[PDB]
Design a protein around this ligand. Sequence first.
Ligand SMILES: Cc1cc2nc3c(=O)[nH]c(=O)nc-3n(C[C@H](O)[C@H](O)[C@H](O)COP(=O)(O)OP(=O)(O)OC[C@H]3O[C@@H](n4cnc5c(N)ncnc54)[C@H](O)[C@@H]3O)c2cc1C
Ligand SMILES: Cc1cc2nc3c(=O)[nH]c(=O)nc-3n(C[C@H](O)[C@H](O)[C@H](O)COP(=O)(O)OP(=O)(O)OC[C@H]3O[C@@H](n4cnc5c(N)ncnc54)[C@H](O)[C@@H]3O)c2cc1C
Ligand SMILES: CC(C)(COP(=O)(O)OP(=O)(O)OC[C@H]1O[C@@H](n2cnc3c(N)ncnc32)[C@H](O)[C@@H]1OP(=O)(O)O)[C@@H](O)C(=O)NCCC(=O)NCCS
Ligand SMILES: CC(C)(COP(=O)(O)OP(=O)(O)OC[C@H]1O[C@@H](n2cnc3c(N)ncnc32)[C@H](O)[C@@H]1OP(=O)(O)O)[C@@H](O)C(=O)NCCC(=O)NCCS
Lengths: 443, 442
Amino acid sequence: MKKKVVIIGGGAAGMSAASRVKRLKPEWDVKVFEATEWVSHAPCGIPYVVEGLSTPDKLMAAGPEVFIKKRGIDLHLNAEVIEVDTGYVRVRENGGEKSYEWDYLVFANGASPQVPAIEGVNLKGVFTADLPPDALAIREYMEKYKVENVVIIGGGYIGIEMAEAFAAQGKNVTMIVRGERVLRRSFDKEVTDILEEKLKKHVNLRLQEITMKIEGEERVEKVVTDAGEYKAELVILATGIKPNIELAKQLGVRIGETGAIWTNEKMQTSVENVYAAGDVAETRHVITGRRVWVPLAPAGNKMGYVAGSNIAGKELHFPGVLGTAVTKFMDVEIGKTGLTEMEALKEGYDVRTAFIKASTRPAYYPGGREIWLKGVVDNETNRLLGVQVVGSDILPRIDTAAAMLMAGFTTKDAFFTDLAYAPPFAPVWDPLIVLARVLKFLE
Amino acid sequence: MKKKVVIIGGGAAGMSAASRVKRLKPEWDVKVFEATEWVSHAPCGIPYVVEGLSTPDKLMAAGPEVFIKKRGIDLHLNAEVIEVDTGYVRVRGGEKSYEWDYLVFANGASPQVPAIEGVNLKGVFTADLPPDALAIREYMEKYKVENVVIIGGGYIGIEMAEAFAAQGKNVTMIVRGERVLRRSFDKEVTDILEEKLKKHVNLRLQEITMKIEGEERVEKVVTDAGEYKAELVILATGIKPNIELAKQLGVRIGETGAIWTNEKMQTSVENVYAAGDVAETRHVITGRRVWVPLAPAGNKMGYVAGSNIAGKELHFPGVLGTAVTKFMDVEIGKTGLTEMEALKEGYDVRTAFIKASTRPAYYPGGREIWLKGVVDNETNRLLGVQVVGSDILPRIDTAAAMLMAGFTTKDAFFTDLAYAPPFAPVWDPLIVLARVLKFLEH
Ligand SMILES: Cc1cc2nc3c(=O)[nH]c(=O)nc-3n(C[C@H](O)[C@H](O)[C@H](O)COP(=O)(O)OP(=O)(O)OC[C@H]3O[C@@H](n4cnc5c(N)ncnc54)[C@H](O)[C@@H]3O)c2cc1C
Ligand SMILES: Cc1cc2nc3c(=O)[nH]c(=O)nc-3n(C[C@H](O)[C@H](O)[C@H](O)COP(=O)(O)OP(=O)(O)OC[C@H]3O[C@@H](n4cnc5c(N)ncnc54)[C@H](O)[C@@H]3O)c2cc1C
Ligand SMILES: CC(C)(COP(=O)(O)OP(=O)(O)OC[C@H]1O[C@@H](n2cnc3c(N)ncnc32)[C@H](O)[C@@H]1OP(=O)(O)O)[C@@H](O)C(=O)NCCC(=O)NCCS
Ligand SMILES: CC(C)(COP(=O)(O)OP(=O)(O)OC[C@H]1O[C@@H](n2cnc3c(N)ncnc32)[C@H](O)[C@@H]1OP(=O)(O)O)[C@@H](O)C(=O)NCCC(=O)NCCS
């Protein structure tokens, strides 16, 4: 008969799972509790609302009424799950604080930014960019106060996307990076260097620097590091994120080695009838089989879909991820899929690599631009372990490579794949195919 | 020890194979005979040189000296192979014979000549090799051309129409069929390109051209429907493989009309290979033999043939029929089988046709993109994908990989495809397509 399903969080994962369950079991009572006023939202668009490319209401996919009226999901907004135990959840709503039973539970509860323990992080003008309310706050601050110098702490992709959003508004932007290069955790050097030459020109890039303090009157005026000081009337916090596991721990939910919630292929946790999905959830790597945490949106959506399916008695397996990701600074596109040279080495693979430059068009169609590719290959199988791409028109290479990795293509398999050619689209030898030829499969 | 290798034709296929052989066997005598002055040339760029996007010398990649001096290939330009027999080739001024131990037909395909009167008037052109682009340019400089007429609704017709429309000319398209590209795509896909095409070109469907009229020069085109003022005509009513020399050697011709080959690109005659637009190949999905005269396949075939000639065994799996082109801002392409082709092949099929956007609603510049999918009901495998609108390349190339590997609808759904707001919407259109199908179980 009928069950009560409860879902914690109204991001991509939560809504994916709610939609899916209700879709499969219309007669079921599917409740969602979302702490904010925002549902079906894209934190991925925050830099572009901040940059001013978009109005803040566009961050919402559909109307909460679509979920409630049209799809029949008992959506509670401004509802924080504060306690959780086996079969129960405790929630605060009208002010008021009330308990609800559940037969199935989903943690779709995301991840929030790491708070670096330096003094003055709580000044007015210090911001983290994680949910849509952050975009509103940043906009209202800049309207109330004249912000001219901005300082970004962190060289991850969020740092970079945020830097772009302020540089594009004519601001003086300074980036503080602990590492020897940007994005050093997720990409190899010869790839990140290409984005850096560009970044360095539009941003004061400060490598190998540890921020000690944020100083300021009623709110932020300066940032002090182990090297120098930097004028700043706005600070963007983005020094990594961590999964929101505190409620899970209350239920004794197994936490994976990554820090995120352990799941299997069906997105089940260690606790029966309890699932986890999205940025909170640890998953599987398609190439290594190791468990890994990749808090991105497409995976998050799929996990939600998968969890819902299984909750509703329709067995379905998530194979895992490839770590596929893309972003851009100005006209410089950057992305990967599969393992970097570093990751593959860490995993004990016997690897060979290649790094090549090519063009996006033939020399007889104009507008051809530079594109660079790095490939990583297991010497014992000739299989592609990963691909990194930087320059322009990278998406078809990344998406195509991703398919290839899903299927375990070799260098020879890639070479003979029937990829498309017309002069307006690409050069006669696709850059991905050139890469494949470079390595040259053998034995 | 050393062998004499001879290669007929200096297009993509010929040069691919010559480079490859010489690369593997530097001590071998590798001769190429190319009828024109052009080597390593791209007929694919002719519309854009005609449109004026490019100067005509950019149709050649590296100088002929790169091949001769730098790579050591005995390249003969302005050399037509006129006769061929077992072990010999006859070439032309001057006419002399050369021995061969291995032979490659890299000999392309030339346009079908429709047998209507006046096709040989000044101003009537075919667009197949680079000299054609030069001829078309010099004609337009010498004579004022204002009305252009294109015969044929294939991709060449369409690319040529764009090249004349973009120059402000009055362009009229005569098409025998009920729609453009009707041979290679389904209706609900071609219709999207047509709504656009119809606005910048006088599109005349279901019309058979009877006559080209003129004095010394073309002035008009007459069809079964009306007449059309015209000072320049493009004929693009299909192409056919150049097999006449092959027949002289008794080379097996496939059911398609092109030269039969196997995976190693060998013909029915020992030590004789074929590569490129002249060659019939294999279909990766159906296993049927098929002719797809396109450039990437042509290059690969050349590479494969060379490898095997030089004692390094290598197999070409075949093609998917992947292809893309564009009219103005309307991109069009496919990979794998259309609904029509799949039905012709006896598959039990289901399909889907969806519209999506290239960005999320919060990043601007999002445009419309439509996808058709064809799926075998007994395996859930993708048989083909068709795409029209904008930003189609990542869908087509990705789908192509998927077809190479035999992905199902579920395999596609769970593929880790990329997302950022500047690149695509949260649900990639390819993934939406896959979901639409829905993996069914017995
Ligand atoms: C600036 C930025 C840029 C990004 N860019 C990209 C990109 O380019 N590409 C990409 O693939 N991914 C990107 N991501 C990641 C992407 O936004 C997430 O992976 C995706 O939103 C995951 O959805 P989710 O539901 O798992 O978690 P989230 O979307 O983070 O949302 C979780 C929700 O749960 C709610 N919640 C938390 N605790 C409670 C509680 N106790 N009670 C009730 N509700 C609660 C929160 O209010 C929150 O709204 C980006 C993220 C950020 C912050
Ligand atoms: C207008 C047009 C647009 C195109 N657009 C696309 C596209 O968008 N995408 C795509 O993938 N493909 C396209 N193609 C196809 C592509 O150009 C060919 O597949 C490719 O050039 C094949 O190379 P090939 O050497 O096999 O044949 P070809 O390139 O035709 O070259 C064969 C050569 O052999 C020579 N030859 C012939 N007979 C003799 C003889 N007796 N002796 C000596 N030499 C001889 C010819 O002079 C010719 O140069 C297009 C073709 C045309 C004409
Ligand atoms: C949209 C959403 C809530 C997930 O719910 P969903 O209903 O599974 O997603 P969709 O709205 O695409 O799917 C609706 C249904 O219509 C179908 N559909 C029909 N025509 C379609 C078309 N032209 N395009 C897309 N989907 C179509 C879908 O395939 C799906 O099928 P189903 O009925 O078998 O489930 C979720 O993706 C979401 O929260 N999105 C916005 C926020 C976001 O993802 N941002 C994350 C961080 S950037
Ligand atoms: C170029 C052509 C002659 C084939 O020659 P090829 O040697 O097979 O291909 P390339 O010249 O690209 O390869 C040269 C070598 O350097 C390498 N290389 C080429 N470009 C490279 C790059 N950008 N970065 C790194 N390495 C590269 C290749 O891997 C190749 O390796 P090999 O030494 O193992 O052979 C053939 O493709 C051709 O005729 N092209 C012109 C025709 C055309 O483009 N269009 C035809 C119809 S539109």
